[PDB]
Subunit: 711 residues, 2 copies
């Protein structure tokens, strides 16, 4: 905030020489001065920037509707109207409700005007800032010597070493002084929820429409642990989504709990869809309790809302009909929910306080909002035992947190209050929708093949487009109406190779080549399956990045039709093994990997492997207990049927836990083994496209091993 | 030439204000002005630079011995003495024989003095320049439009294309305008030896002490062809050194000639030594004529003087006792011979015109002198048929030569006239000798192992150190006294692995690792054998490069004793196959390649393979004739005995033709086949150290093929 914009030169002297004196005084007060030519120049200057902290304009040539337009753009922005001809009498109430401060044109009075402008800018900065970030900035500005942890003590240890000086010159001084610990008593403490921290969690609670809100400093991988260790005591039972994270599996291995796994649907692409409506009612839950050993009525439920590919649920249905005392939504990919009414009825915090149960939501703030990594939140909705749940939160977090992460966690919510946050969210959603409309437009504009995007055939409104059973763009057969809602900002491109009914085509490009090409040209894809990409259109995405992406896709199309060699187009993949990719064209490589997928029948195996659940011999807690006692042997992959698995098997494709720790592959679940063997067989042909299975360990001969339990 | 150096400020005004006016006038005439503080400053300024083209000094405070010292440094350098107090009378003859022009201290007369200084500098430039380079520079300065070949026509085709503009911006304008053809009539023609060209060959003839000197524009690979096609008609017989170039083999395949091969000696290192004294007398030559089919008395002899490793011959012995009518010295590696009396009696042009035979010498000017590549000369000594030999020269050279190469060829000799060329050659030889003295000093200073240099144990004088039979540093057993002379500027380092008697040690580093490390650190080795390097200490080498080399050797020693990994120290070799060099230390790699050399017994096989000559079934001209008719088949390497070879086999190590085209490997020459098979066996283990055999073609299975003749 040092940019203060003065409107145009009227022409007469008595209201220009005071303006030039105020210009000189403001430059003396370390303010950059910009000179927009007219009104629309000011509108564009304010929307394209954010460092602007003041507008000076004459109240004669520009009326007070150029206070209201800026108010629609930013409510808290100070503007400085200069009163010459309009008297006191010419002011309405709507002018008085805006951030304007009136001044006069007097020669030699520029010093007091500049001091008042500096004070107003300071008030604006101290108004828009959240309280803990405000206090941290104040503490760094009054920077005191310290004799406490951390050891760098304001980064003055990095000023006395060469590699330390490189680190210090990279990061800069303010992010070294911002790292302090709980010994600084004026900032309170995260662990005890005191002072500026307590004001911060109350601020987070207002913003996100939650009763009590927490600010985790390790991540939602730890927030899931906190929620599932509070609400699910040992010996109890949980309803965990099979579409889960590794963190929930880790939680189940720490705690002595027992699962019933929900059964999500999926298409031939490998996109993890959702649980049908039948598996949230009392009948199916009671049945699955009945045929699970050592199982009682579930006391907690964990649901991934949304999925990895951005499929929201009808959460009002869930909160009405799921008859458990605590429903947890692992909303790691949807933290931005409250800030656009598009997502109404699509999160745990949507709607009011539900009766008889506590709704948890564990937004991963760093993922889609603007926050530093390892930042997360736990929003609750209901009544919880305050000391027990506070102690459970204290149990998993560290004792001396990184205050940069905490300040970023709060500043992410502070970016969403007012009109600026609504403008951010609506701009991101509208930009995502416009990108979707041209990618379907360029599909019908181009010749031959082009990238498809997995979205409804007619989208033109800003809403979460519901997945209807009467349409076939999604691919989930016999899907329930109003249970799924596509998130517009998680754009999933598609590549040729798949037909609409689910069978495979002949000409195709698997998405690994497209992702590697985009990585070569300096744009990064989130994660790819066999024939899909994913692009997070968060609040950071502007039209520069969107156009560069669209124009990396087009250059890939041109380079693939021209059929350039692997050496020229993909040097990063060429360097994987130059002997192999020396005389190979890209069309031959794409055709070869596509034929390896087709002949081995990848999508049918990937479907039929996840439509059958492995037999739960013992709870994953018992599997971890037997793993700790050294009762694990590494049998080869083929002889794994009838054996209890000790470590989780997580195959890419698709990215969802296939075999849990403690489950047996029986003869009824042989397509699981066939899929694993097929994936190992196809991954050992072409370098750079190596097999990515978390749990299976590569040997030298080419056959993988899985840690199973001894007999 | 725009640097004119004025000596110090006396203090009084009448000889300072004219000096300042002359300063201003000379800067107006585009002369850079330097200000050395005193006399020794001027001496150091002149030796460290060459762009200085004038010294202005006062004749009072500095005597005329600071004209004689500069004359010893540069004879033609103009200096401008300013006469104030010493009258006309105070001048000796030795002052008058120097390049001084006297001036006076007059106010307002700086314009005429500056014009005279500019004219004197122009005279100096037109004096030191050779005539054809002078005329080419004049032609480019008066740059005229052209409508003839070449097509770029002064580089104005490169000013109208993007990649052409990149080429033009790299090379610069003057080297584009300098490329013209024979259509420019004022520069004469190389082919017809007219005008400025004819003055250039006469200039080359003076400089190098030769009767008729030619300036080849393809290289000495073509000069050897010219000499051997003039002096050796078809059906005649030649005495060609076995230590020859590929170009001489190519000459023998073009022309219908018949060889007797001289038999050079060699040590266990693989250094190609020289022919003994017995193989230049009439008895052995007549014997080898007698047991060669279709052979008569030789009419020409070709001798590589020096060898690749810089071993000069006692050429007076050769020119006295070799009873052939034309002796050719392929002096590609020793072109600098005339310019230091160290090399007296060590070239074809050494001594006077020998009676009864014509001595050829074909100095490769680009190799060790300062000339552009593909530049060569043919110096003759004797009487030749002028039109026949001119037509033979015209036969192999092009018709439109690159005048940059021709101008560089003449300017290389022009760099050697006067005191500057003698200073260059003596400085290069003295720098080489001083480098040799510290590399033997650092060998005895360091701990454990260090690099040895293959040179006599006591060297302290500036001479070609003779290879004496009473010493064992060279390794050539029963060598003849005063037949070999080590060239001091071709420094051959040695690595551990060899004992002094010829047997192999246990701890060793083959020279490929050292060469690759030096290439990683940005210094290039000429060519390496198994355990030797080679460094050309030409006139370009100053102490910066020498110290950087010595200090790349030392850093290699430190990194090898510390035993750093291949990944950190040799990333360029790491990228050859990252899977193999991932977890390998440098000591393990060096030990492994050394053990591969030891167990397979490389030096004994490399010795015994070259001590036996393959059986000449037919002349290489007939081998090329049968090769052109498609009578060649590719048999594998093992079944090559009893078969006539069609293409030359040139194995690295060492770098000398082993099997000639048209020769059979018999049972008496089985160690040749054993050496070839051993080299193929050891080269197929470690990547980046691949087998380098010119003639043997690699197959996919790992067994090589050689093109032999059909039966």
């Amino acid at each position: 905030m040092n940019v203060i914009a003065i409107l145009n030169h009227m022409g007469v002297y008595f209201k220009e020489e005071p303006i030039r004196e105020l210009h000189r005084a403001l430059e003396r007060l370390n303010f950059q001065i910009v000179y927009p030519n007219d009104r629309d120049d000011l509108l564009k200057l304010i929307e394209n920037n954010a460092r602007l902290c003041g507008v000076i304009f004459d109240w004669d040539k520009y009326n007070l509707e150029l206070c209201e337009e800026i108010s629609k753009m930013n409510e808290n922005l100070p503007l400085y109207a200069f009163a010459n001809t309009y008297s006191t009498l010419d002011v309405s109430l709507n002018d008085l409700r805006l951030q304007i401060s009136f001044f006069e044109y007097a020669l030699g009075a520029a010093e007091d005007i500049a001091n008042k402008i500096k004070q107003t800018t300071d008030e604006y900065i101290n108004t828009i800032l959240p309280p803990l970030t405000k206090a941290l900035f104040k503490y760094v500005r009054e920077g005191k010597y310290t004799f406490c942890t951390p050891g760098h003590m304001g980064g003055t240890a990095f000023q006395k070493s060469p590699v330390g000086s490189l680190f210090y010159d990279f990061f800069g001084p303010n992010t070294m002084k911002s790292d302090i610990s709980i010994s600084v008593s004026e900032l309170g403490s995260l662990l005890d929820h005191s002072g500026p921290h307590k004001e911060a969690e109350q601020y987070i609670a207002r913003v996100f429409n939650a009763d009590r809100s927490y600010m985790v400093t390790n991540g939602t991988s730890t927030a899931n642990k906190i929620v599932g260790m509070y609400s699910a005591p040992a010996g109890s039972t949980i309803l965990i989504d099979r579409n889960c994270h590794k963190s929930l599996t880790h939680l189940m291995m720490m705690s002595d709990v027992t699962p019933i796994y929900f059964r999500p649907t999926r298409n031939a692409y490998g996109i993890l869809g959702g649980i049908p409506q039948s598996e949230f009612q009392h009948a199916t839950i009671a049945k699955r309790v009945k045929e699970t050993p050592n199982a009682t009525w579930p006391v907690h439920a964990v649901i991934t809302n949304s999925t990895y590919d951005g499929l929201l649920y009808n959460t009002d249905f869930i909160k009405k009909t799921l008859d458990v005392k605590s429903i947890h939504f692992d909303s790691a990919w949807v933290p931005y929910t409250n800030f656009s009414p598009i997502y109404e009825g699509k999160c745990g915090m949507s709607g009011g306080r539900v009766e008889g149960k506590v709704i948890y939501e564990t937004q991963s703030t760093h993922k889609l909002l603007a926050a530093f990594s390892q930042a997360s939140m736990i929003h609750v909705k209901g009544d919880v035992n305050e000391e027990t749940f506070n102690e459970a939160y204290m149990m998993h977090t560290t004792t001396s947190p990184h205050y940069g992460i905490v300040a970023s966690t709060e500043t992410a919510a502070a970016m969403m209050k007012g009109n600026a946050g609504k403008r951010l969210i609506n701009g991101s959603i509208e930009r995502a929708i416009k990108f979707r409309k041209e990618i379907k437009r360029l599909r019908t504009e181009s010749d031959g093949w082009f990238f498809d995007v997995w979205q409804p055939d007619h989208i033109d409104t800003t809403e979460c487009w519901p997945l209807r059973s009467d349409s076939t763009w999604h691919g989930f057969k016999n899907i329930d109406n109003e249970h799924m809602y596509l998130d517009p900002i998680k754009v999933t491109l598609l590549t040729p190779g798949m037909e609409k009914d689910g069978t495979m085509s002949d000409f195709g490009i698997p998405a690994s080549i497209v992702a590697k090409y985009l990585d070569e040209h300096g744009i990064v894809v989130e994660k790819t399956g066999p024939y899909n990409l994913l692009f997070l259109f968060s609040i950071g995405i502007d039209k520069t990045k969107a156009l560069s992406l669209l124009r990396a896709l087009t250059d890939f199309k041109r380079a693939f039709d021209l059929n350039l060699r692997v050496k020229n187009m993909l040097p990063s993949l060429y360097r994987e093994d130059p002997e192999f990719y020396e005389n190979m064209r890209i069309q031959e490589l794409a055709q070869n990997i596509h034929k390896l997928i087709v002949h081995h029948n990848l999508p049918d195996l990937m479907y039929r492997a996840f439509e059958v659940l492995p037999t739960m011999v013992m709870t994953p807690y018992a599997a971890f207990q037997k793993e700790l006692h050294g009762m694990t042997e590494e049998v080869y992959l083929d002889e794994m049927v009838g054996r209890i698995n000790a470590n989780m098997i997580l195959p890419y494709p698709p990215g969802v836990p296939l075999v849990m720790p403690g489950e047996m592959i029986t003869e009824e679940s042989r397509p699981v083994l066939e899929f694993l063997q097929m994936l190992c067989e196809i991954g050992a042909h072409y370098p750079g496209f190596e097999t990515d299975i978390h749990g299976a360990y590569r040997q030298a001969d080419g056959r993988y091993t899985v840690k199973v339990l001894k007999e």
